[PDB]
Design a protein around this ligand. Structure first.
Ligand code: MG
Ligand code: MG
Ligand code: MG
Ligand code: MG
Ligand code: MG
Ligand code: MG
Ligand code: MG
Ligand code: MG
Ligand code: MG
Ligand code: MG
Ligand code: MG
Lengths: 292, 204, 159, 169
RNA sequence: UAUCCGGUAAAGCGAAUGAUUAGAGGUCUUGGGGCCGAAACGAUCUCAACCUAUUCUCAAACUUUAAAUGGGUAAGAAGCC
RNA sequence: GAAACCUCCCGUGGAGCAGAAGGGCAAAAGCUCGCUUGAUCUUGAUUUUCAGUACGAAUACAGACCGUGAAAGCGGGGCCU
RNA sequence: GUCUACGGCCAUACCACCCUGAACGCGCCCGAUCUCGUCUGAUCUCGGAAGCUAAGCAGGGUCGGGCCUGGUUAGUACUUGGAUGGGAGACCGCCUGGGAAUACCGGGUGCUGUAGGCUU
RNA sequence: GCUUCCGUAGUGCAGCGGCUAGCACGUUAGGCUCAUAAUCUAAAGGUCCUUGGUUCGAAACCAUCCGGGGGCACCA
């Protein structure tokens, strides 16, 4: 036996936390410093750019909080990349860069800032900040939201951040936690970052497995042999993907029709049904004990 | 020895118990609060004779001890050594204070002197359960125990079954319906809200 | 005498209610406040900077200054012989909206609508409030049966 | 017919508690380093106990958690010492077990007059594919109710894997 | 008339903190006076600290609740569109 | 061994936050790390005992210069009294 | 009908056990070369897809515990104002108005916003 | 009244929370001496005043009660 800690008194004194806290999704201590606007602004949105890394997806959204819940003003998913050229490799650093770039260019041509603030067209790898142009509508500002991801040097959240900055979103940041940062000498090489953006870290390991052994290469990159993805095709493929994002980042929905409207879920049992169930269980127990 | 109970009779001050703040309290005179054949079931002592006060006052622990000894002695001489069960339903916790002289009133706060029990109007002082053939002896025992307390008390043979909260006319009906389980000195109530495994452990 | 501390006797005032401890919810952080808003004050034990004094807990004033993450408010304090309109700077979490003005604003909107209505018609409609009137004399019916005779119960001793 | 309910050794925890400080502690650290191939981590005290000769924050013991095939090989050495036999009371309620040996030289470690005599203590922590939820970052949760490892399951897994001759009592 | 503030009376402690009465069922788990035994968690119970539902009495410096009496606000031209 | 060290599970805070007590706090306001000196300079306004005078303490701000973090922001001494 | 990401209210949402998950998901999972940090790729980070609903998660159930909301308790305890009311007092009764909380007994067991999917 | 001190074999006492309650004066051996005086060491030596409580464990720490004893209580 044990001394039962979880008693009726324990459940009476027990206070639950918030719903997203119990699910394990929201850092409220982080969001209380992120999302609240100063009160001398009185109505303005405070735009945050949320990056969430999934095992098979990358979600990059731009939102602002209201009292009835926040409203997404723009969204971008990493599974929109087969519409642009990236057939496979939807969850790596280059896909995060393309998702952030698509988010930025979609927000710019939905607000009307397509021609003004072109961003970094020719990708270099250095530091970049979007400066406000006088006589023009100002540059969009938003603040990054990494959520519950440990932000070390070389994160896909920061890759999507660099993609949004190269798309033209005026986000305050630093080159300290971009990949390529030297930890013991504290300078930014700005060429290793270009290799990570263009995807040479994956292609060099493809070449390494190709010279090591064919079976482990196939096991690691089975859908890179599928659709004919060679390591020499990789940089030109991401160049064509970036060009496709810059020439057409607008989004189209789909005509959701022809739904049979059936119920895959089990409906809820009612009061008379539960009372009849427990009455039948009592009667069945009495009928079982009136036998011997 | 101590000051007479004319001075410590009425509920004059706030209830002042022994706690972390009030330390150094002398121990109460009454130690055992219930005796007789207390190792007994509810099915054999259906008497439920109560001493009920009629004044909002304070009763001392030494008076509780004296009335317990008097009721115990008369019930042993009347019905037997193990034919009754006496509870004293007043546990004294109010610490009374003493201001003894050799200054005078200069910085006059009391040291703890003893314990006393706040008694409401309509509150049970003592309770005796035994058989139904014992009513006059229980009434005379409580009458002899009234003479150790100040104020005015009453003796009432209640409608309950011994030391339970249930009425005696419906007690045997609830036991026959197995809504009540005889559990030691008291009784256990079964609502229709538990799990069905408890119902299956019963009724078989 | 007592002590002159700022939080003297705030054991229940500047405390959180039962099973409502923990993280302050975020809509409370992101209420908006303008100049002249009627605002009541309720102190919160979690947030401790910008806390008002205990003589303002439950008092209601109007907003004169809106800073970055605090609100200035002109409250009314009765200092023994006179009521003073005095200005205190209270942080957001110790501040709600007072709904004593909202029913007045809805009544003003209803009166403006009922004044624009029936203005070209010529009829005069009573727009003021009126207290509880006499209960407008009527018939109390019964379907043949008689009223139930109540009886004072006989006394029996409970204890 | 269960596809991925295969019970596996999640880790193997080694420790040596030399008791006091210093030279015996770093000597047992050298013992654990020669046993594993990785630098172990020392463990200090919680509070001062006068009867044990220990003080607060004084380094007492040394430990090392081993994962995978190296833990499999070290536990093969340990059961090769302990004759594949355990008891009923050696198994915990959560399905993890352990045992301690009195001489580290039974595991194949060569003797040294300088690096002296040290017993050590193994604790096998068993696992399943799917116990990363209880220690991952964002969406933690209790790993089911019929998914936990039971004592009966630990007994039958040990008898199926290492040919268990577990004796009662 | 609407809108907030309380933690006092009352009540509760089969809800937390502190005190505190007695039965019932369970080798959680040891130990002391003990009895049958060289001993045994082998049968009998005991108390110190154990558990499970019960039961009796409380708290100015306890409280899930929680009044009556009170305390601020608004009942317009210094207001709306 | 009841307390040395390792692991699993339960664990609403029943621990800790320098002290007396109260309140407050669970991916903190606690412990351990990494960097630091907002514990810097200069005008006013306000609260607290109040006569609405001081002193002490505190509250939002304003101008600079900074620290930290990827940023939101936080900090011009101590979680508040 | 339902899921994902971010949520508002913060247990009608939690906790214990059992059953069901088609598709998109979400994850479990496979490894450590690159970025990264550990005694240990267990955690974190990175590169993926051979299996899987076993687990999380979603839905339902328990004469479930808890929680929310009602009746009883009870016009009871208490309480504003009043009397040349009673009583040696303690306290109690009336007029005048308000008015609880246990135990006990019923019902329910999450709604909703934004953006994007699946059941074409 | 207040501040206290001590309750431990027949006796004076001692006792760093973990001892077999050191040990001496008595009672009873026994060794030794030519026999005796002192001994140098052993046995039958403890209602830790009493109750209650924390700790794993109490004479040792805390609270009450019960017995012996020390000192202060000033001007009109
Ligand atoms: Mg953070
Ligand atoms: Mg008095
Ligand atoms: Mg008070
Ligand atoms: Mg009271
Ligand atoms: Mg932190
Ligand atoms: Mg400044
Ligand atoms: Mg601090
Ligand atoms: Mg892994
Ligand atoms: Mg599953
Ligand atoms: Mg399942
Ligand atoms: Mg229920």
């Amino acid at each position: 036996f044990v001394k039962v800690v979880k008693n009726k008194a324990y459940f009476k004194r027990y206070q639950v936390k918030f719903r997203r806290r119990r699910e394990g999704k929201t850092d409220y201590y982080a969001r209380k410093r992120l999302v609240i606007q100063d009160k001398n602004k009185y109505n303005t949105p405070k735009y945050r750019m949320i990056v969430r890394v999934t095992n098979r997806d990358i979600i990059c959204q731009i939102a602002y909080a209201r009292i009835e819940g926040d409203m997404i003003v723009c969204a971008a998913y990493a599974h929109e990349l087969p519409k642009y050229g990236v057939k496979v490799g939807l969850t790596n650093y280059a896909a995060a860069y393309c998702t952030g770039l698509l988010l930025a260019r979609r927000l710019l041509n939905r607000f009307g800032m397509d021609k003004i603030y072109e961003g970094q067209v020719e990708v270099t790898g250095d530091e970049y900040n979007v400066e406000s142009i006088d006589g023009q509508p100002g540059a969009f500002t938003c603040y990054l939201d990494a959520g519950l991801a440990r932000t070390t040097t070389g994160n896909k959240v920061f890759g999507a951040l660099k993609g949004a900055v190269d798309g033209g979103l005026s986000i305050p940041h630093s080159t300290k936690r971009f990949p390529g940062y030297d930890s013991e000498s504290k300078e930014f090489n700005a060429e290793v970052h270009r290799k990570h953006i263009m995807g040479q870290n994956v292609a060099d390991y493809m070449r390494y497995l190709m010279e090591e052994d064919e079976d482990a290469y196939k096991k690691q990159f089975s859908q890179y042999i599928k659709n004919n993805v060679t390591p020499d095709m990789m940089e030109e493929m991401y160049k064509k993907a970036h060009a496709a994002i810059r020439e057409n980042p607008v989004y189209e929905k789909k005509p959701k029709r022809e739904v049979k409207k059936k119920r895959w879920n089990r409906p809820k049992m009612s009061l008379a049904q539960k009372k009849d169930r427990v009455a039948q269980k009592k009667a069945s127990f009495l009928r079982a004990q009136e036998r011997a | 020895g101590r000051r007479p109970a004319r001075c410590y009779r009425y509920c004059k001050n706030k209830p002042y118990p022994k706690s972390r703040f009030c330390r150094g309290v002398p121990d109460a005179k009454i130690r055992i609060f219930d005796l007789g054949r207390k190792k007994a079931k509810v099915d054999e002592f259906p008497l439920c004779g109560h001493m009920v006060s009629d004044e909002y006052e304070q009763l001392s622990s030494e008076a509780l001890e004296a009335a317990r000894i008097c009721a115990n002695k008369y019930m042993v001489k009347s019905c037997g050594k193990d034919g009754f069960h006496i509870r004293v339903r007043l546990h004294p916790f109010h610490v009374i204070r003493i201001n003894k002289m050799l200054t005078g009133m200069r910085g006059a706060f009391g040291k703890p002197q003893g314990t006393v029990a706040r008694v409401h109007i309509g509150q049970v002082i003592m309770s005796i359960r035994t058989k139904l053939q014992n009513k006059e002896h229980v009434v005379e025992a409580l009458r002899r125990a009234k003479f150790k307390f100040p104020g005015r008390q009453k003796i009432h043979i209640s409608k309950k079954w011994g030391f339970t909260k249930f009425n005696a006319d419906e007690f045997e009906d609830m036991v026959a319906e197995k809504r009540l389980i005889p559990d030691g000195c008291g009784v256990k109530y079964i609502p229709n809200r538990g799990p069905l495994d408890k119902w299956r452990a019963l009724h078989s | 005498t007592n002590t002159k501390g700022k939080r003297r006797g705030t054991r229940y005032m500047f405390s959180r209610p039962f099973r409502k401890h923990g993280v302050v919810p975020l809509a409370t952080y992101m209420r908006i406040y303008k100049k002249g808003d009627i605002v009541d004050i309720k102190g919160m034990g979690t947030v401790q900077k910008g806390m008002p004094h205990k003589c303002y807990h439950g008092k209601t004033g109007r907003v004169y200054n809106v800073t970055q993450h605090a609100v200035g408010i002109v409250v009314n304090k009765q200092v023994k012989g006179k009521i003073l309109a005095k200005r205190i700077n209270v942080r957001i979490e110790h501040i709600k909206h007072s709904k004593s003005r909202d029913s007045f604003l809805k009544r003003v909107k209803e009166n403006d609508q009922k004044k624009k209505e029936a203005k070209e018609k010529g009829t005069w409609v009573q727009l003021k409030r009126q207290p509880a009137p006499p209960r407008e004399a009527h018939f109390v019916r019964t379907n043949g049966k008689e009223p139930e005779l109540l009886e004072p119960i006989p006394y029996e001793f409970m204890a | 017919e269960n596809p991925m309910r295969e019970l596996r050794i999640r880790k193997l925890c080694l420790n040596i508690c030399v008791g006091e400080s210093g030279d015996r502690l770093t000597r047992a650290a050298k013992v654990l380093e020669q046993l594993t191939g990785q630098t172990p981590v020392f463990s200090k005290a919680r509070y001062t106990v006068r009867s044990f000769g220990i003080r607060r924050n004084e380094k007492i013991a040394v430990h090392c958690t081993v994962r995978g095939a190296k833990a499999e090989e070290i536990l093969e050495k340990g059961l090769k010492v302990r004759e594949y036999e355990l008891r009923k009371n050696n198994f915990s309620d959560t399905g993890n077990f352990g045992f301690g040996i009195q001489e580290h030289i039974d595991l194949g470690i060569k003797y040294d007059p300088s690096i002296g005599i040290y017993g050590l203590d193994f604790y096998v922590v068993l696992g399943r594919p799917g116990f990363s939820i209880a220690d991952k970052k964002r969406r933690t949760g209790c790993i089911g109710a019929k998914h936990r490892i039971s004592k009966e399951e630990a007994m039958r897994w040990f008898q199926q894997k290492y040919d268990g001759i577990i004796l009662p009592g």
